[PDB]
Structure 1
């Protein structure tokens, strides 16, 4: 689990979104595993605006942060899970590291801020849903 809180937005894994997230839906993309909902409280998170390929992610299944190199956001074939059939997930970044389903929502951070959230895993890889292209997360 986990979310990004920026302005009046909450960013979550689309497959972990709650009834309240869907009741307050701003934007969702099934191809990206992202959903953004509106919040009443102001979020303080800073979104990175950059092309970093190094950062640190939180891994709840190890209670640890790990430094990783990760690929630029791309269209990656992702195996079926129970939340999706096998499909191309877009805007996905891969790194070598540990990820279990409950790790979804762990933040990946660079020097500039929040890069994305854990979305996929298995075969010793971790996939992060990029958010850096969502420039609208920083206004109204």
Structure 2
């Protein structure tokens, strides 16, 4: 679990969005595993606008933050789950690191701000949904 709170927006993994997120929907994209909903309160976070390929992410299954080197956002094949059929997920960045299903939503940050959130994993890999291209979040 986990979300980004920026301005009057809440960014979550689309597969973990609540009834309230869908009732206050701003934008969603199944191909990216992202959903953005509106909030009444002003958010705590700031978004990176950069091309960093190193950062630190929060791993809830270890209660720890880990440093990572990650690939540029790209189209990556993701196997079927209870939430999606087998498909290509776009704007996804991979890194070597630990992840379990409940780890989705953990923030990845660089020196400039929030880069993205955990969205995939397995076998010593972790995948992050990039949010740096969503300029309208600001």
TM-score band w.r.t. shorter chain: over 0.9
Q: Distance in 2 between matches of 1:115 and 1:14?
A: 17
Q: Are residue 23 (structure 1) and residue 26 (structure 2) matched?
A: no
Cα deviations by residue, 1:47-79 (Å, 9 ceiling, x for unpaired): 000000000000000000000000000000011
**Residue correspondence of structure 1 range 1-140 to structure 2 within 5 A:** 1-138=1-138
Measured after TM superposition, the shift of residue 35 of structure 1 is 0.1
Cα deviations by residue, 1:10-60 (Å, 9 ceiling, x for unpaired): 000000000000000000000000000000000020100000000000000
After TM superposition, where is structure 1 displaced by more than 6 Å over at least 4 residues in a row? none
Structure with the higher fraction of residues in strand conformation: 1
Measured after TM superposition, the shift of residue 123 of structure 1 is 1.8
User: How well do the aligned residues superpose, as a CA RMSD in angstroms?
Assistant: 0.4
Q: Which runs of 5+ in 1 are unaligned?
A: none
Q: Distance in 1 between matches of 2:25 and 2:80?
A: 25
Q: Distance in 2 between matches of 1:132 and 1:100?
A: 24
Q: TM (normalized to structure 1)?
A: 0.98
Equivalent pairs, count: 138
Q: Which region of structure 1 is more displaced relative to structure 2, 17-26 or 78-87?
A: 78-87
Q: Distance in 2 between matches of 1:127 and 1:85?
A: 17
